[PDB]
Structure formats: C-alpha cells, structure tokens
C-alpha cells in the first residue's frame, strides 16, 4: 500500500470540458477515460494554455468481453449488440471538436465473428472521408490473432496502428486476459507492417506490475526486432480496490532513463513518464518526431 | 464532507489512483 | 551575474534585455490597423521585446511593424519560436496581400518588412501569396522598398524564384543557429544546407537583390561554430548578417543556455566587417527586422563600390 | 471589498477594512509573459507611494513593481513562490502580490478608475 | 494668409515649427566640434533641422555640415545669418586634418563639407577645401564626400582644384531665380556664374555628380522657377533641392510668401519630368538635408 | 526673491510674497532666435500644471509656453508688446512672461535647480 506524490491530479474543470462530455452523451458514445478512471481526464479533455482538447472514444459499448486484471472496464459474458450508428456518430463528434489528430479505441468483442474489425474500419473510413487531413490512431485489440481482422483495420486508411503488449512476457498471465499473450500482440503489430508497409506501429507497456529492469530491456529490444516504430511507458495505477495492487512506483528519473534507451534502439519516438498513457499527448508526439 | 458529484468521480479511498 | 545556465536551473534575465511595456498612440494605431484588416505580425506572435520601440516610433522615427502573412499558425514547431502550431491551418486569406498594402499605406512606411509562417500544407509554400503582397505594395506605391523574411520552402527552387522575382529589394532567410544545433533548435524540415541554398538561389535568380540572414546566440554554440557559420554564409554570397540574443518566449520553449555580453556582440560585428558583409547588425536585442530600413542604407554604400 | 483602481505603472488596488490588496493588471501580465519569479517585499516593510517594492521576472521580460499607496506591507502571496504563474492566470484574484495598510488613504483619488485605465491603455 | 504686405510680416506656418535641439547625439556632436575648433553651417545659419540632423537614429545617422575656413564670411548675403567681416582671420592649417578626425569619430558613410567665402584668399580657399577631402579619403577611402563650395568668383583653376580632389558630389547653389540674384545674393555672385561652376565641375571631372539648391518664398513666381529648373537641367545639373526660405534674424530678408507643402511636392514632380536624378523638395528641405539618403536611394541604381 | 527653478520645457520660475514670475531660460531663447511676437494670456486666467498658457514666435522658430505651476495669472509683461526682443536680450530680468499666484507651493519640488537644468540640457551623466 503506497501512495505517490507525482501521480496526483485535479478534479475536472468544465470550461471547455462539458462540451465534450455532453457531446458523448448526445450521440450515446463512450470513452476509455471515464471507464478506466484515468487521472489525466482534466489535462486531456481541457487544454490549459494551447493544447487542442482531445479524447479517446471507446467503441462497441462500455462493457468488454474480457476481464483484464489491470482494467476497470465492465466485463460481461455477452455484451449488448453493436450500434450501427456508432461509426457515423463518432465521425461527426471528432470533426465537431476541431481535432487534427484523433485516437480511437474499443473494448474487446470476442462474441463478434470478426472481433469488430469491420466496425472499427467503418469508423475510420467515415472519419477520413469526412476529413482527409485528420490523423487517426486505432488502439486495436488482438482479435485473438485473427490475421484477416488485423488486415481489415490496417487497410482502413489508418495512420498509426496501435496494439499494446501491456507488460513484459513473464507477467502476461497475471495482468492480461488469457486470450491475450505477448507473442500474439507482437503478431498484431508485425502483420500490420506486412499488409500496410507504410503504417506506423505503436505499443504501450506498463511499469509497476512486478517487472524488473532486465525484463523491460528484453521487451523493448524484441519490439524493435518486430519493427515496431513507437513505444509508450507509464506507471500502472490501481483502478479500484478489486483490481491488482501496485508493486513498485517507478521513479521519474528511471522513467526518463528508458526514454534514452528507446532512442538508442531506434524507436521513432519513445514517450515515457509516470502519467504517460497510450494516447497521452499522442498528437503532440506525432508533430515532434514523425513529420520528418 | 465531499460532494456526491466529486465522490462518484473521486475513486476508492484506501484515493486508489 | 552567472550568465551561463547550470543544469536543471535557469538563468536570471540580464539588465540589458529589459524593455518597457508597449503602449501609446502609435502602438494602438498599429494595433487598430491590424485588427480592422485581420492581419498579424511576428512582433505579437513571437512576442518580441522591441514592440514598444518599433511600434511606438519616436520624434523622427516612424512607427513600423513586420506583418506576418498566411495566418498566425505555422506548420513547423520550432522549439525557440512561440508561434502556434497546427498541421493543417485554415486556408489562405485571399484578401491579405491586398489588405497588407492598405495597412502600410496608412502607416506611411517607405521601407516595409514582410514575413510569414511556414505553410508546408501549401504546394508552393505560399510563395505566390508572398509575391502577390509585394505586387500590391509596388502597385499602391512604386517607390516603396520591400524586404521579405522568407521561409525555406523546403528548398523548392521554383518557390524561391517566385519570391525573388516579385520586385523584391531584400531577400531575407534565417539560419537561426550553427549547423550543430539545427536539429535541437529548428523543425526537422529545416537544416543548415537548405537555408544556405535558399539565400544562394535568390542571388542566382536576381543578382541585384540583397541577401540577408540572422543568427541567434545563446543556444549552446561556441565561438568556433559562430565564425565557421559566418564564413560559410559569406561563401554563399550573403550580403548582410544579424546577430542577437535568444530569449525564452514562453515557459514551454527552450531555456537560454547563455546570455551573451554586449561587448561580445560588438566583437562579432567586427568579424562581420572582416569577412566582408555589407553590415553586421550585432546586439542583444537586435532582431532580423530591427531598423531594417536603416541598415538598408549600408547595402547601398557597399553596392556603390 | 471596493472597486478596482489602477495606476500608470499598470498596478491595481482594492481596499477593505483599511487593508489594500495590490497586483498588476491583465494588460501588464499579457505584455510581460510567463512569470517565473516574484520578488516580493517582507512583511512590515514601510512603503511610500511610487516606491519600488519588488519586481516581476518573466521568461522574455522583467518589470519593477512600484507601490501604488503609502503604508506598511501586511501580507505577501506565498503561493507565488511555488506557482508564479498565478500572476498571469489570475492577476485579479489568486495572483495578487502584496497586502498593505493605508497611511494616507487620500492617495486613492490620484489613481485611475477602471474605465479611465481602459482608456489609458488604449490611448482613447 | 500666406502673402506678405510691405508694412506687415508673415506669420510662421505650422509645418515649419521644429523642436529645440538637445539630447545625447546633439551634445556629442557639439562637444566634438568645440574640442577641434570646428564650425558648422547648421549653427551659424541657424538651421531649424539641427535637432533632426544632429539627432540621427543612433547607428550611423548623427550628421552635420561642417563649415570650413572660419565662421566669418567675406560676403554679406541678405538671407544668410553667417557673420560678415572684410578681413577674416587666416586659415587654420589643422582644420582639414581635424575635420577628418571629426568625421571618422562620427563614423559617417556620406559627409557634406561647406565653407564661408574667402574672397580675401587668392584661390578662395580651394586648396584648403581640397586638402580636407584628401584627408577624408585617406582615413576612409570608402566614404562619400559632397562639397558645397563657393563660386570662387568664377576662377576656373579654383573650381577644378576642388573637382579633382577625389570628390563624389560637387554642390553649388544658385539660391534663387535670375531675376532675384541682386536682391538676395552678394553682388559678387550671379546666376550665370553659378552655372559655370557646375558646368566646369563636370567638364573637368565627368564622373562627378552636380547638385544645386534654390530657396522659395523670396518673391519669385512659378514662371521663373520653372524656367530656372530648365536652365539648370540644360547645364547638366544632376540633383536639385527646393526649400522654403526662413528669416534667420530680424536684420535679414523677410519671407515674401510661405509656399504650401503641396506646392513643393508639385515641384518634385516637375524635377522628375525634367530628368533630375533626384529632386529633394519640401518646406524644411535644405541642401544637406538627408543628402546621403537622397544620394544612395537614387544614384546607386 | 528666491532662486529660480527650471522645467523640462525650458521654463524658469521665481517666487516672492506668494507670487511666481515665469519666463524662458537662456538656453531656450538662444535656440528660438529673435522673438517677434509673444502670445500671452489675460489676467485672471486660472492655470494648471503644464498647461499651454501662451506661445512665442521668432523669425525662424516658434515655441509654445507651458506654465510651471498651478494658479491664477496676475500680470503679464506689457513691455513685450512693443519690445518682444526683451526675451532674447534679458530672459531672466526684463523679459519675464507672466506673473501668477501659487495654488500648490509644493509644485516647486518637481522642478530642477540651477545645477540640474545645466546637466539636463548638456546630457551630462547624472
Ligand atoms: C481499455 S484498453 C482498450 C483496448 C482493448 N480493449 C485492449 O485492451 O486490447 C486501453 C488502455 O487503457 C489502459 N489502462 C486501463 N487501466 C489502466 C490502469 N489502471 N493504468 C494504466 N493504464 C490503464 C491500458 O494501458 C490500455 O492500453
Ligand atoms: C516567423 S520567423 C520567420 C522565418 C520563417 N518563418 C522560417 O522559420 O523559415 C520570425 C523570426 O523571429 C525570430 N525569433 C523568434 N523567436 C525568437 C526568440 N525567442 N529570440 C530571438 N529571435 C526570435 C527568428 O529569427 C525568426 O526568424
Ligand atoms: C553653406 S553656405 C553656402 C555655400 C557658400 N558659402 C556660398 O554661398 O557659395 C549657406 C547655405 O545655407 C543655406 N541657407 C542659409 N540661410 C538660409 C535660410 N535662411 N533659408 C534657407 N536656406 C538657408 C543656403 O541655401 C546655403 O546652402
Ligand atoms: C488509469 O491509469 C487508467 C488510464 C486510462 C488511459 C486511457 S484514458 C488512455 C490509454
Ligand atoms: C523574441 O525575441 C521574438 C523576436 C521576434 C523578431 C521579429 S519582431 C522580427 C523578425
Ligand atoms: C536656415 O534655413 C538655415 C539653413 C542652413 C542649412 C544648412 S544646415 C545646410 C546647407
Ligand atoms: S481487454 Fe482487458 S484492458 Fe481492454 S477493456 Fe477489456 S478488460 Fe479492459
Ligand atoms: S517555421 Fe519555425 S520560426 Fe518560422 S514561424 Fe514556424 S515555428 Fe516560428
Ligand atoms: S556667401 Fe552668402 S550664403 Fe554663403 S556663407 Fe557668405 S553670406 Fe552666407
Ligand atoms: S491519457 Fe487522456 S486520452 Fe483518456 Fe487518460 S484522459
Ligand atoms: S524587431 Fe521590431 S519589427 Fe517586430 Fe521585433 S518588434
Ligand atoms: S539640413 Fe541638417 S545638415 Fe545642417 Fe540644416 S541642420
């Protein structure tokens, strides 16, 4: 039982924030920020000085078919069916918020035959046809290694294909649902590079789940052997009392250390920090390292 | 005390994160 | 004081960099002209310390400002420049070149400096938009002198040619820093060799035009790199040079690594004369557009020989 | 509390129960930039009108603070030490500089009203 | 009310009011002159542009017109407030050397030299003027020198002495129209003689640039001014200057008419039609008023 | 009769029995030249600090006059009507401009002394 000082946040202020909160409920859309109970809700939904207010619309309802021990998203054996209006409504809300860079995600839908690859592809197609110059990033589930489902999402005009390994291989069974493993998540990023050679790969790992420095180095080196472009490192924080406890709060100085090691291995950009999540300032990192 | 609106978006005091 | 930054810590502002809060009649006259025509200036967006001096004018000095074309949002994200950043800014205002000529006509300027954001979203980088502004200026007043602080256009020779053939009097493009600090200070779409090719190609297209560039000191460069840079600028046939102190515009931009002494700036002007520049505007608060019309007379002196 | 009155050095003051709160105007903070250090006087410092009681230092600029009133410094904003951005974010509320007494309350007639200061900064 | 009656004097128009000269550059230039025993036509003729010319712009713009050969002229022009005496003191041999020191101390790229008339000297001081130009081109071969010389009573050897001194601009003023030469200028000067000075200057030195100045408001009319500008352009005079005559003291000529600023801008248009390389026209325009700026912005291209 | 104090607009002032005598300094009259007309206010005119109460006109120059104090005009120099040259020939004695009462006797603290005005017109570092 440890409580750190550099992981404290603020209660959401509603100057530019209720516009996003009321838009999500007008179109009956969900987001991963509210379900996962992220502390960076105020920073991401409301730019302090000059940061475009962004979000992460979570598709296919607020209930996941999987139960990951680090995630507080609701889990049900059979979630409600797909909403056909979700891909169309999402494209409107994103263009309404004036985003030049948007990142989309969704819960796992193991009950769907394609796992929702066609539903995600229609959300990107409606969003790119409406605004061709907007940048889209998809945090894709593993689809249980369905190479056809991964190909369908990667060929939807995607700019950055994102699928997270979450933690080191030795902690896959304790942290993630058994339907997800380390080698499977790598085959999601590898196959996206084969079907779409010009795509940008991106993944996120979490620290504080019992991993050591030796295990983390082998994971990043294996990701570079998978030709993964981008990497994200962040401190795992306990969502609810029912989920896993934090094992070790990584120091911000060591968080900065892995940023140099990522630059050594050749990662196109390594975003590391205690509060750094997958989509945390994703558009800002794109403008600083991926445009030449 | 604490506001219900704040409490529902606060967390679990042990907050938890 | 310390004048050199220790790691983690930041420097105190030297007294010679303190300026007055801008206000007055000429300051508001220029402010009202810009807002009535939806125009922008790099003075405001880059937060120049010389606003009060340039916009305020004086007894015999005319109030002037450097109008910034193609919006207030750039496509580059330079870590030293407080100009806002977006990948796809709104489309160009077709009336901006025409309105710019009307703004200068109100101010009665004989020498005008123009600049712009970088528009990497535009196929020609806005070269035609810049050349159109010079045309409307010569149309409203044929006896006007125009200087263009021009973006690198990513080395596009046709874009550089279109600006250099617009009736320009001074073609200005800044290298900002020494080659060893280009990646840290500037957007990756800009590099040292590219900026020199811009200045070199402008002289090739129009030999009568004046080449002009600026360098910021205080970002971590040493004296060897500064002299090597100035030597390379002369070999690119750059006519004149400007040196100034880099000053942190906002909390989120690069910290000053060292505050150069006023005497050291006087030495770099001495080197500029040795290397053969027409002039070398060297000083802590000296910027590219600072008294540009006043320094233009130095070009005419060297041209006479 | 009372209405806000400004001086020519872009400093405001509001009085309440014989205590004057002093800060800088929104026009001054936008012209200075991101404040990074607040040089404030110590409690008990006797100040006369137009006396330099401190200075504000931003990233690209610096400004010397001059006292709008005559009196004794009663309080300084300790929050500015760890968060000097309050001067830019909330120059009229959370970014006040010092609080002082009024050894000569008739000096408030010399300051400009809020309407007079708006005309002062716009030259109208 | 801009026309003058006999018993009445004209009121000073608002466009001719200037400020009292003072400041850093004004006192810097004035201290340099006193330490070297130098004189300027700005102070002796009491020019209203002293605050502007000696003020400059704090880089390479604080300028003044040094007056050689003492502050006392051998002639008495009814428009000029320079002192007059039959026997002025002899020439200071160090004045050409000290003048070059003052100009180098000011860091000027374009310098204008002038002097009183020395009709007591056998050459009118031409050698003295030429020696000052030689010292300037010695310390700074890049400098541009303009000489506002006297007429030397038409001495061809004295004119070519200054013209061949390495000069850049040879300036000599006709001051007024030919019909007003007797009223305005000393009888030792006339209109045709002033044109001979400019014609002979180019004749011996073709690369030189001619320059002359005229004062408006002494009683001339538009028909005489236009005919004078034709005779000047016929004499191959390159540059022309038009300005308003202003009464220096009570003992000098009264202003007959204050010419409007719009009329000066019309005469500038006439100068362009006639082919002058530039035409500096304006109420406060003098021969040396921003001379370097007019030279560089017109003659280099 | 106390010592005279100068302004930044080259205006001196002496006080005696609560009456202030106003004129222009010797540095100003040399810069203006031969004065030919003196525009002076009428008696009883109330003046404030730095108010344009009159103006001087010379043959080659013209300068406005600003009151160094606040009060009511008591007397103007009638000798300047037919002899405007007294401002040049005697700016500190017989060439005074106006005489006025003093509303604020503490306004003399704002002005300069004989030494400070000499450093002000010569730009001497102090
Ligand atoms: C909810 S998942 C959505 C994608 C898909 N449902 C999956 O996991 O494959 C999106 C992100 O939320 C993050 N997340 C959830 N709870 C978290 C926590 N307690 N600490 C840090 N990240 C968390 C994970 O890092 C994950 O990358
Ligand atoms: C709008 S840029 C014009 C050049 C063009 N937009 C480009 O980068 O290719 C205006 C100039 O302001 C100057 N500038 C911006 N921030 C500065 C700072 N913090 N300190 C000194 N100069 C600065 C730079 O010299 C820059 O060249
Ligand atoms: C520099 S000397 C002329 C050179 C030489 N002494 C000669 O007369 O041949 C006097 C100069 O001052 C100018 N000047 C003198 N008094 C003037 C006045 N009251 N108004 C306009 N110009 C005046 C004359 O035009 C002339 O150029
Ligand atoms: C608590 O740490 C949950 C974090 C959720 C991060 C989402 S908003 C983006 C990946
Ligand atoms: C900060 O120093 C920004 C400087 C901007 C210079 C502009 S106003 C002229 C090029
Ligand atoms: C009064 O008008 C005297 C003008 C003197 C002009 C000198 S400074 C240059 C010829
Ligand atoms: S797959 Fe795991 S982490 Fe993702 S939403 Fe479902 S339970 Fe949460
Ligand atoms: S290109 Fe760089 S220096 Fe020029 S406006 Fe854009 S950010 Fe500023
Ligand atoms: S010649 Fe005439 S104009 Fe020239 S200085 Fe002598 S009196 Fe003056
Ligand atoms: S990182 Fe931002 S996108 Fe969800 Fe968490 S609030
Ligand atoms: S140098 Fe002057 S032109 Fe912009 Fe900066 S304020
Ligand atoms: S024009 Fe200037 S150079 Fe003498 Fe007269 S002051």
CATH code of the domain containing A47: 3.20.20.70
For the CA atoms of A163, A164, A170, A176, what is the dihedral angle to 10 degrees? -90
Contacts of residue A209, Cβ cutoff 8 Å, sequence gap at least 6: A70, A167, A171, A174, A175, A236, A244, A247
> Are C88 and A133 within 8 A, CB to CB?
yes
- Tell whether ligand 5 has an atom less than 6 A from the beta carbon of residue C49: yes
> Are C247 and D59 within 8 A, CB to CB?
yes
In this structure, the strands spanning F5-6 and F11-16 are antiparallel
On the 0-12 / 13-18 / 19+ scale of CB atoms within 10 A, A77 is exposed
Cβ pairs E/F, distance under 8 A:
45
The C-alpha angle with vertex F53 and arms to F52 and F59, in degrees rounded to 5, equals: 85
- Best substitution site from A7, A36, A189, A236 to test ligand 1's pocket, by max atoms within 8 Å of Cβ? A36
Q: CB contact, 8 Å: B6 with chain A?
A: yes
Q: CB contact, 8 Å: A50 with chain C?
A: yes
- Tell whether ligand 2 has an atom less than 6 A from the beta carbon of residue C195: no
Report the nearest-CA residue for atom 4 of ligand 4: A38
Residues in chain E with CB shorter than 8 Å from the CB of C291 are 57, 59
In this structure, how many other beta carbons lie within 10 angstroms of the beta carbon of residue E76?
14
> Are D61 and C250 within 8 A, CB to CB?
no
Contacts of residue B7, Cβ cutoff 8 Å, sequence gap at least 6: none
Contacts of residue C54, Cβ cutoff 8 Å, sequence gap at least 6: C43, C48, C63, C64, C65, C66, C289, C290
CA gyration radius, chain A: 18
DSSP category for residue C8: T
Residue A277 CA to ligand 4 center (angstroms) comes to 6
Residue E76 CA to its chain's centroid (Å): 16
- Total structural domains within chain E: 1
In this structure, how many other beta carbons lie within 10 angstroms of the beta carbon of residue E94?
11
Sign, CA dihedral C288-C294-C296-C299, equals: negative
Under 8 Å between Cβ of E162 and E197: no
Q: CB contact, 8 Å: D18 with chain C?
A: no
- Tell whether ligand 6 has an atom less than 6 A from the beta carbon of residue E47: yes
C135 annotated ligand-binding residue: no
Q: CB contact, 8 Å: C18 with chain E?
A: no
Closest Cβ–Cβ partner in A49, A50, A287 for C87: A287
Under 8 Å between Cβ of E197 and E173: no
Q: Give the Å distances, CA to CA, from C260 to A18, C178, C183, C244.
A: 48, 15, 22, 9
What are the extents of the domains in chain F? 5-102
Q: Which candidate in C242, C297, C298 is best for mutational testing of the E interface (most E CBs within 10 A)? A: C297
Under 8 Å between Cβ of A267 and A258: no
Containing C11, the helix (H) or strand (E) segment is none
Closest Cβ–Cβ partner in C88, C189, C252 for A100: C88
Neighbours of chain D (3+ CB pairs under 8 A): C
Q: CB contact, 8 Å: E296 with chain C?
A: yes
Report the nearest-CA residue for atom 6 of ligand 11: C51
Phi, psi of F24 (to 5 degrees): -105, 150
Q: Minimal CA–CA distance to F68: which of F32, F35, F27, F112?
A: F112
Q: Give the Å distances, CA to CA, from C240 to C167, C173, C276.
A: 19, 11, 9
DSSP category for residue C200: H
Helices (H), C6-126: 25-36, 42-45, 51-56, 96-107
Rounded Cα–Cα distance for residues A60 and A120 (Å): 9
Residue E49 falls in which region: left (phi positive, over 0), alpha (psi -120 to 50) or beta: alpha
DSSP-derived 3-state class of residue E198: helix
- Tell whether ligand 6 has an atom less than 6 A from the beta carbon of residue E288: yes
Neighbours of chain B (3+ CB pairs under 8 A): A
Under 8 Å between Cβ of D31 and C22: yes
Resolution in A: 2.6
Residue C238 CA to its chain's centroid (Å): 15
Which residues are registered as beta bridge partners of E77? Answer: none
How many angstroms separate the CA of residue A179 from the nearest CA in chain C?
39
- Best substitution site from C31, C43, C148 to test ligand 11's pocket, by max atoms within 8 Å of Cβ? C43
Contacts of residue A191, Cβ cutoff 8 Å, sequence gap at least 6: A147, A150, A151, A154
DSSP-derived 3-state class of residue C10: coil
DSSP category for residue E154: G
- Tell whether ligand 9 has an atom less than 6 A from the beta carbon of residue E75: yes
In this structure, the strands spanning A101-106 and A74-75 are unpaired
Q: Minimal CA–CA distance to E247: which of E50, E5, E46, E8?
A: E46
Q: Give the Å distances, CA to CA, from C103 to A163, C59, C139, D9.
A: 53, 21, 14, 31
Under 8 Å between Cβ of C185 and C145: no
Rounded Cα–Cα distance for residues F31 and F29 (Å): 5
In this structure, the strands spanning D52-58 and C280-282 are unpaired
Query: Does E8 fall in a domain?
Result: no
Q: Give the Å distances, CA to CA, from E140 to C298, E33, E101, E134.
A: 15, 20, 11, 10
> Are E142 and C305 within 8 A, CB to CB?
yes
On the 0-12 / 13-18 / 19+ scale of CB atoms within 10 A, D115 is exposed
The C-alpha angle with vertex C255 and arms to C249 and C259, in degrees rounded to 5, equals: 95
Q: Minimal CA–CA distance to A217: which of A172, A262, A179, A159?
A: A262
Containing A161, the helix (H) or strand (E) segment is strand A160-162
In this structure, the strands spanning D11-16 and D5-6 are antiparallel
For the CA atoms of E56, E61, E67, E68, what is the dihedral angle to 10 degrees? 150
The C-alpha angle with vertex F9 and arms to F4 and F15, in degrees rounded to 5, equals: 25
Q: Give the Å distances, CA to CA, from C254 to A18, C249, D12.
A: 33, 8, 32
DSSP category for residue C180: G
Query: Does A109 fall in a domain?
Result: yes
Helices (H), chain A: 18-26, 32-36, 41-45, 86-96, 117-130, 147-154, 172-175, 182-195, 213-225, 252-265, 282-289
* Residue located via tokens 């027409």: C278
Q: Supply D38's token pair.
A: 């607040």
DSSP category for residue C176: B
Q: CB contact, 8 Å: F125 with chain E?
A: no
Query: Which chain D residue lies closest to C48 (C-alpha atoms)?
Result: D60
DSSP-derived 3-state class of residue E81: coil
Query: Does C9 fall in a domain?
Result: no
Rounded Cα–Cα distance for residues E205 and E160 (Å): 8
Length of chain B measured in residues = 17
Rounded Cα–Cα distance for residues C163 and C132 (Å): 9
Phi, psi of E26 (to 5 degrees): -65, -45
Sign, CA dihedral F92-F96-F102-F104, equals: negative
3-state SS of F36-57 is: EEEECCCCCCEECCCCEEEEEE
Q: Give the Å distances, CA to CA, from E2 to A62, B1, E267.
A: 89, 86, 18
Under 8 Å between Cβ of F70 and F48: yes
DSSP category for residue E75: S
Q: Minimal CA–CA distance to A103: which of A164, A149, A147, A151?
A: A164
Phi, psi of D108 (to 5 degrees): -65, -25
Under 8 Å between Cβ of A234 and A273: yes
Query: Does A208 fall in a domain?
Result: yes
Q: C104: domain range? A: 15-304
The reply to whether CATH 2.40.50.100 applies to domain D5-102 is: yes
Q: Supply A208's token pair.
A: 């504080």
Under 8 Å between Cβ of D97 and D24: yes
Q: Minimal CA–CA distance to C249: which of C185, C178, C173, C198?
A: C185
Ligand 3 atom at minimal distance to the Cα of residue E213: 25
Rounded Cα–Cα distance for residues C156 and A217 (Å): 43
Rounded Cα–Cα distance for residues C258 and C248 (Å): 11
Rounded Cα–Cα distance for residues D20 and E29 (Å): 50
Q: Supply B8's token pair.
A: 């529902």
DSSP-derived 3-state class of residue E117: coil
Closest Cβ–Cβ partner in C59, C294, C304 for E19: C59
Contacts of residue E138, Cβ cutoff 8 Å, sequence gap at least 6: E100
D and C: touch, per 3+ CB pairs < 8 A?
yes
> Are C59 and E60 within 8 A, CB to CB?
no
In this structure, the strands spanning D71-76 and D46-47 are antiparallel
What are the DSSP calls for D12-76, one per residue?
EEEEETTEEEEEE-HHHHHHH-SEEEEE---TT-EE-TT-EEEEEEESS-EEEEE-SS-EEEEEE
- CB crowding C126-158: b at 16 or more within 10 Å, else e: bbbbbbbbbbbbeeebeebbbbbbbbbbebbee
Rounded Cα–Cα distance for residues F88 and E112 (Å): 32
Residue D6 falls in which region: left (phi positive, over 0), alpha (psi -120 to 50) or beta: beta
Q: Minimal CA–CA distance to A134: which of A151, A157, A161?
A: A157
In this structure, the strands spanning D98-101 and D71-76 are antiparallel
Q: Minimal CA–CA distance to C167: which of C180, C148, C190, C194?
A: C148
For the CA atoms of E245, E247, E253, E255, what is the dihedral angle to 10 degrees? 60
Ligand 12 atom at minimal distance to the Cα of residue E65: 3
Rounded Cα–Cα distance for residues C229 and C242 (Å): 12
- Tell whether ligand 9 has an atom less than 6 A from the beta carbon of residue E130: no
Rounded Cα–Cα distance for residues A180 and A101 (Å): 28
Which residues are registered as beta bridge partners of F16? Answer: F19
Residue E210 CA to ligand 12 center (angstroms) comes to 19
E288 annotated ligand-binding residue: yes
E and F: touch, per 3+ CB pairs < 8 A?
yes
In this structure, the strands spanning D52-58 and D46-47 are unpaired
Which residues are registered as beta bridge partners of D66? Answer: D52
Sheet with C40-41: list strands edge to edge: C40-41, C67-69, C111-116, C145-149, C170-172, C210-217, C240-245, C280-282
Query: Which chain C residue lies closest to E56 (C-alpha atoms)?
Result: C60
* Structure method: X-ray
Q: Count each helix (H run) and each strand (E run) in chain B, helices first.
A: 1, 0
Ligand (nearest to CA of C293) = 11
Q: Give the Å distances, CA to CA, from E257 to C194, E185, E264.
A: 62, 18, 13
Q: Minimal CA–CA distance to E12: which of E278, E228, E217?
A: E217
Q: Minimal CA–CA distance to F23: which of F38, F37, F13, F9?
A: F13
How many angstroms separate the CA of residue C96 from the nearest CA in chain E?
29
Q: Supply F66's token pair.
A: 């600003």
Contacts of residue A186, Cβ cutoff 8 Å, sequence gap at least 6: A165, A222, A223, A226
How many angstroms separate the CA of residue D26 from the nearest CA in chain C?
12
In chain F the first and final C-alpha atoms are separated, in Å, by 28
Residues in chain B with CB shorter than 8 Å from the CB of A39 are 17
Residue A238 CA to ligand 8 center (angstroms) comes to 42
> Are E12 and F63 within 8 A, CB to CB?
no
On the 0-12 / 13-18 / 19+ scale of CB atoms within 10 A, C35 is exposed
Residue A59 falls in which region: left (phi positive, over 0), alpha (psi -120 to 50) or beta: beta
Contacts of residue C67, Cβ cutoff 8 Å, sequence gap at least 6: C34, C39, C40, C41, C100, C103, C104, C112, C113, C114, C115
- Tell whether ligand 2 has an atom less than 6 A from the beta carbon of residue C120: no
Query: Does A3 fall in a domain?
Result: no
Residue A71 CA to ligand 2 center (angstroms) comes to 46
Contacts of residue E37, Cβ cutoff 8 Å, sequence gap at least 6: E92, E95, E98
Q: Minimal CA–CA distance to E126: which of E135, E115, E137?
A: E115
E147 annotated ligand-binding residue: no
Residues in chain B with CB shorter than 8 Å from the CB of A238 are 16-17
For the CA atoms of D91, D92, D96, D99, what is the dihedral angle to 10 degrees? 150
Phi, psi of E174 (to 5 degrees): -90, -15
Contacts of residue A245, Cβ cutoff 8 Å, sequence gap at least 6: A1, A238
Rounded Cα–Cα distance for residues E129 and E167 (Å): 11
Q: What stretches of chain F adopt beta strand conformation (E)?
A: 5-6, 11-16, 19-24, 35-39, 46-47, 52-58, 62-66, 71-76, 98-101
Helices (H), chain E: 24-35, 41-44, 50-53, 95-106, 126-139, 156-163, 181-184, 191-204, 222-234, 261-274, 291-299
């Amino acid at each position: 039982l440890r409580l750190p000082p550099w992981l404290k946040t603020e209660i959401p202020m509603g100057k530019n924030y209720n516009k996003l909160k009321n838009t999500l409920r007008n179109l009956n859309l969900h987001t991963v920020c509210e379900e996962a109970r992220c502390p960076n809700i105020g920073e991401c939904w409301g730019g302090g000085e000059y940061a475009t207010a962004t979000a992460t619309i979570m598709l296919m309802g607020d209930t996941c078919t999987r139960g990951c021990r680090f995630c507080s998203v609701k889990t049900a054996r059979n979630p409600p069916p797909l909403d056909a209006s979700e891909p169309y409504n999402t494209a409107k809300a994103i263009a309404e918020w004036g985003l030049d860079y948007v990142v989309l995600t969704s819960v796992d839908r193991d009950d769907m035959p394609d796992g929702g690859a066609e539903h995600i592809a229609k959300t990107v197609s409606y969003l790119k046809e409406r605004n061709p110059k907007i940048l889209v990033e998809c945090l894709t589930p593993d689809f249980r290694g369905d190479l056809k489902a991964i190909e369908k999402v990667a060929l939807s005009g995607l700019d950055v294909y994102a699928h997270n390994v979450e933690t080191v291989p030795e902690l896959q069974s304790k942290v993630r649902d058994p339907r997800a493993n380390f080698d499977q998540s790598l085959r999601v990023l590898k196959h996206a590079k084969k079907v779409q050679p010009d795509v940008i790969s991106k993944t996120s790992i979490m620290l504080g789940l019992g991993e050591n420095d030796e295990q983390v180095y082998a994971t990043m080196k294996a990701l570079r052997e998978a030709d993964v472009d981008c990497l994200t490192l962040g401190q795992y924080m306990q969502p609810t009392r029912r989920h896993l406890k934090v094992e070790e709060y990584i120091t911000p100085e060591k968080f900065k250390y892995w940023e140099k090691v990522g630059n050594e291995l050749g990662f196109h950009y390594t975003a590391s920090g205690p509060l750094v999540r997958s989509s945390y300032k994703a558009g800002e990192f794109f403008l600083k390292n991926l445009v030449a | 005390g604490i506001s219900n609106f704040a409490q529902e978006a606060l967390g679990d005091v042990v907050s938890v994160k």
